[PDB]
Write a protein that binds this DNA or RNA. Structure first.
Length: 134
RNA sequence: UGACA
């Protein structure tokens, strides 16, 4: 009861995460907190086991969002991820994870780990990688 | 000088 946060779980996508979070908080409230939970935090891309620092949860696009390829092949997250790495999205109706370095614009550290992630593949971490050297 | 977006 009234449980929150998660000490860097082994395996679980932030979709499954933000999912349980969907079963608690209100609507407006929901989105506000959830993000705070993943924001500044990082996720593990199941398809390419690569972790990026989620600084913003894209509560607009779904794992279906598309984009053209080299020659212009329009493939969706679901596709690019399923065909190239086969990570079966499945929850093709949740948001996205806009991972951004969002450096402190201070001196010249420049933060790393930017990426448009699928919440259904992001193994919640706890990295919160700050590494920049400002 | 934004490293499988």
């Amino acid at each position: 009861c009234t449980d929150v946060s998660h000490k860097v779980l082994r395996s679980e996508t932030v979709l499954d995460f933000m999912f349980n979070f969907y079963h608690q908080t209100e609507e407006h409230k929901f989105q506000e907190q959830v993000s705070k939970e993943l924001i500044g935090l990082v996720v593990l891309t199941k398809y390419n086991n690569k972790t990026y620092r989620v600084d913003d949860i894209d509560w607009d696009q779904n794992p279906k969002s598309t984009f053209k390829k080299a020659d212009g092949s329009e493939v969706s997250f679901l596709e690019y991820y399923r065909k190239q790495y086969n990570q079966e999205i499945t929850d093709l109706k949740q948001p996205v994870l806009v991972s951004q370095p969002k450096r402190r614009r201070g001196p010249g550290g420049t933060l790393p780990g930017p990426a448009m992630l699928i919440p259904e593949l992001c193994y919640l971490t706890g990295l919160t990688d700050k590494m920049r050297n400002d």
